[PDB]
Amino acid sequence: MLTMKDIIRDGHPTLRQKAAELELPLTKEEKETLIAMREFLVNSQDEEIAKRYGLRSGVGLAAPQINISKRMIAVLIPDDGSGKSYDYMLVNPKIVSHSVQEAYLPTGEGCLSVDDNVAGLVHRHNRITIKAKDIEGNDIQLRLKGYPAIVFQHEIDHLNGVMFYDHIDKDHPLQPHTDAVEVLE
Ligand SMILES: COc1ccccc1NC(=O)N[C@H](C(=O)N(CC(=O)NO)CC1CCCC1)C(C)(C)C
Numbered sequence: 001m002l003t004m005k006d007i008i009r010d011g012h013p014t015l016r017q018k019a020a021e022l023e024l025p026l027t028k029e030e031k032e033t034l035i036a037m038r039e040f041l042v043n044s045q046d047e048e049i050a051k052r053y054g055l056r057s058g059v060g061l062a063a064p065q066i067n068i069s070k071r072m073i074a075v076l077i078p079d080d081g082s083g084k085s086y087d088y089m090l091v092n093p094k095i096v097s098h099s100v101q102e103a104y105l106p107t108g109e110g111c112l113s114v115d116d117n118v119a120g121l122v123h124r125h126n127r128i129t130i131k132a133k134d135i136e137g138n139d140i141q142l143r144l145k146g147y148p149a150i151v152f153q154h155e156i157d158h159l160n161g162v163m164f165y166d167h168i169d170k171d172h173p174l175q176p177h178t179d180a181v182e183v184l185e
């Protein structure tokens with residue numbers, strides 16, 4: 001069972017590396033890693049389990065964050081009220097197209113690997129299309145908008161050694177870009 005002790009902290013070199021593409025099919029250990037990454041998110045969203053094991057309630061995890069430099073991510077976003085929910089383990093995900101229009105969470109972002117909050121807006125594409133493989137090497141193409149687009153972009157950033165605060169404007173951290181969509185979750 002993965003817990004917070006498996007999550008490496010900002011400053012760790014692995015978080016600034018470019019993660020390696022996976023060869024398909026995944027090895028057994030790679031599948032078990034990806035499943036455990038998802039399971040961490042599941043456990044983190046269980047009030048009782050999360051309390052028992054001191055887990056921060058998570059919606060996404062990238063392999064680099066558990067010190068594994070491989071292009072694998074898990075995303076687990078519960079129903080936003082509209083019946084839309086996202087439960088995906090992706091291999092070699094790639095944003096293949098996106099909107100010009102930007103979107104941002106009004107309170108900024110945070111990260112499992114960053115202990116202290118950093119204030120500032122993180123502008124991302126409002127809409128993205130991702131191609132990826134699933135855990136069995138089958139093809140997945142996602143069209144995402146708003147909150148889940150933000151989450152997936154945050155995760156894919158980790159695969160490229162990019163941290164959320166890299167995007168924050170130092171002079172005007174809280175100034176929204178023109179026509180950027182404020183996203184509420
Ligand atoms: C189920 O819990 C929720 C329910 C409703 C809204 C939000 C959440 N959870 C989160 O936002 N969770 C954040 C998160 O998992 N991440 C993922 C991460 O660290 N990815 O690398 C940070 C998010 C900030 C913006 C997108 C990802 C942390 C950093 C605060 C733990």
Ligand SMILES: [Zn+2]
Nearest residue numbers: 110111112113
């Ligand atoms: Zn993160």
